[PDB]
Amino acid sequence: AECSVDIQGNDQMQFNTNAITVDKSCKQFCVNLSHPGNLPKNVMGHNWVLSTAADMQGVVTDGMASGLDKDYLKPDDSRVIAHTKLIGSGEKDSVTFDVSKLKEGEQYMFFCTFPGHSALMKGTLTLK
Numbered sequence: 001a002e003c004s005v006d007i008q009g010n011d012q013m014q015f016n017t018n019a020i021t022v023d024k025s026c027k028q029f030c031v032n033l034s035h036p037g038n039l040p041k042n043v044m045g046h047n048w049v050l051s052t053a054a055d056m057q058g059v060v061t062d063g064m065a066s067g068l069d070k071d072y073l074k075p076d077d078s079r080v081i082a083h084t085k086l087i088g089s090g091e092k093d094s095v096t097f098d099v100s101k102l103k104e105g106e107q108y109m110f111f112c113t114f115p116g117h118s119a120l121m122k123g124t125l126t127l128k
């Protein structure tokens, strides 16, 4: 339970946490994304996407250009460490990834890549 976290993305374009700490001793880490609200995926879709801070903007811009059918992520984007699928209200999806893909001292960002959402739907992730 300290190798996993529940996060919500709602109808008002926000996650319910903007900082995540991953414990170094965790071999794997799991994020459970749910979407309270009423809006459908094609209007207020949310995913949970992880990259380094420096790669976030690039991931977001290319993802936006990839369209709804591609869950607003460039296929095989080498900058994406982990991601859930894009979900609408009433849905949930998790992602489990190797913690060895992170390193101490580097700033990671988690974010949604649905068009415009990362303005508010982002947060730091850190390994400790």
Ligand SMILES: [Cu+2]
Binding pocket: 009, 044, 045, 046, 047, 112, 113, 114, 117, 121
């Ligand atoms: Cu979103």
